[model samples]
Target: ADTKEVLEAREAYFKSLGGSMKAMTGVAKAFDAEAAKVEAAKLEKILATDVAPLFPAGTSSTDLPGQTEAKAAIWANMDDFGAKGKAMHEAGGAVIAAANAGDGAAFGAALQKLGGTCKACHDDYREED
Candidate 1:
């Protein structure tokens, strides 16, 4: 099987992402810029350092049915996937910048934009759960 712990790690990464998002949301609701900055930095690091390598070929759902939600198109359009991931990293940076500025409104806006990048990639390359 092309699938291995790489697929498992990918899933765990996303699960951790969900955890981070939840933490970020709590801070956003409180408008805690300091906490938000930390969360935003963490998200950015995950996107930049943890995500790209998780998509190496042969790990998509087509390659390992029932084991992954990643679509085969992720492999077919590797550049697109990578571009989207880069966009996510950029969005996360925007979030961090907003948090650093202590502008709650901008932080909210950037947070939403970061979410859009995630959904954009998922819409194109992830199977609906």
Candidate 2:
């Protein structure tokens, strides 16, 4: 697909990720195991299955100036980027595992680690606006 379409998809996908994070945070804070499981699964699905296609080559901010927050560095260092994505997926799974086990402390800890993955990827791959 073209740059604009890919960028728009990325926007929606990332927004969904943000929403899921917020939902998980709320559920975790309330110590709701069922809700945490549902919320955490959304993140797992997004990171594991929905994120990669949103990042097509030539869609980076450097390629289409003023059109995206994605850095050209992502395409250049795709292996490292993929590794970060893998970490995010794994972190999501950890969150779900904690929720499944009904472990509040573990759930919160896993969620924090998941958030760290977000920061790690953004720090390296996204351009500051």
Candidate 3:
């Protein structure tokens, strides 16, 4: 029973993480649409501080179920997963800095980098919709 409960809890946590990722993606798009510097900074902060922490060390691929949108490759390549998460956070920070500085070109480049991080992670860690 305890094992079953643990699995259930892990599954719920994994699903919640997926939902948060989806939400952040939408927020990123909105930030791009408005090019609103302050909001962009806030969104970036949320991604780094709030969202990233949800995928902590030692989270297993088997913890998730149902459609299991999480790719098994993540468990097989844990180091790369951590690297991708770190890259995303760093890219987000750079983008936020550019946004805060109100440099259009810098902002655009940073945003592109941020998008690349997202795509990289999705390509390797998420199942196709």
Candidate 4:
């Protein structure tokens, strides 16, 4: 398999999210409706490729120091985590699709779904500050 950005980053994996992950997190956390539409579109393209490989065996919060909320439990349930990742990516993509269609209702619903997907994963795999 080809190297993932996380693998290439190695020690700096969590330090910077890079690529779509960076853009996705950026607008999500800050709430920029217009910019988010652009980021969600970018994320849709990024997640089209396999995402599970991004997290190697020992790159969890336990392995990395500071700034990461990646719990070790993730490695044990990669399939489940991958599904959540894909779901959130799809949710974000739906937002872009709806926004592109100019369907305000659809865009709002999909954006909420995207936030919920993130919360679901955070509740399970991410560590609290």
Candidate 5:
């Protein structure tokens, strides 16, 4: 059984993390729609640097009362979890760099790779709504 404070903290953290991901999705769409490359790059930097560091090793999963979309598998397979996070950061950075360099093919490839990373993590760790 989890304590109330722990549950609340978990919910808060999850919300914050979800908000970041939502913002990243919006930014990715904007990038696809030919929004300013610099602006998209800024968003990517936030995703990679600011957001990825928030979920440290043990905090990846919390035993909150509600039905969290996160699965126990994340904590059980922590090495893979950390690897997925790192891959997202790496792929996102690559996309931003490609955008900065004005390389269309590179940008497309990087974006596809980043999307793959997101999907891979989601498939393993997220439950369907």
Candidate 6:
């Protein structure tokens, strides 16, 4: 139960992340493209401000009784893990800035960069599902 609440919240926040991304990116406009951009900005804020608190002890795959790809390295090397999180937040901020600026190419490039930041964490901290 240690991860119960945080996991649910993380999942919900993740869902919103997809929604916001879809809204901000190409063709499938959510009827409110600008609104989507704003939503994305909000997601960035939550991710930057709220992420570090979610993955506490007992949440890693071998510890918690849930479907998770989180690896033990996150708990073992938490300082490095936290730094990656901070990096992710910075990258995410760049995405928000680009998205809100309305330059498609700029946003696209920044999105790719953000994805790299995500990959960086995943590579070091997450296990394959």
Pick the lDDT winner: 2
lDDT of 4 at 55: 67
lDDT tens readout by residue for model 4, 1-129:
333457554325333324545565555555556776676666566546554567677776777656356788998998888888878777867877875665556766776787688788879898896
| C-alpha lDDT of all candidate models, in order | 0.82, 0.85, 0.62, 0.66, 0.63, 0.70
How does candidate 4 score on lDDT? 0.66
Residue-by-residue lDDT tens digits, candidate 1, 21-69: 7787788788986787788778767765566667787787877789889
Ranked candidates (TM-score, high to low): 2, 1, 6, 4, 5, 3
Model 6, 31-123: lDDT tens per residue? 344764776667666675476677777788887635777788888998998898787778778777766776566667776776677788879
Candidate 3: 10-residue stretch with minimal lDDT: 49-58
Clash count for each candidate, listed in order shown: 0, 0, 0, 0, 0, 0
Superior candidate under lDDT, 2 versus 3? 2
In TM-score terms, candidate 1 sits at 0.87
Q: What TM-score would each prediction reach against the true structure?
A: 0.87, 0.90, 0.62, 0.65, 0.63, 0.75
Q: What is the lDDT of candidate 3?
A: 0.62
Q: Model 5: per-residue lDDT, tens digit, 1-129?
A: 234444455556556545544654565554543543755555464564343343433433355324455677876787898899888878878877877776666766777787788798989987665
lDDT (Cα, tens digit) per residue for candidate 3, span 1-129 = 234444455456545545545544554555543544655645554564433344443444556454245667776887898899888778878867776776666766776787788789989897775
Error of 3 at 63 (Å): 5.7
Q: Stretches of candidate 4 above 4 Å error?
A: 1-40
Judged by whole-model lDDT over C-alpha atoms, candidate 2 comes out at 0.85
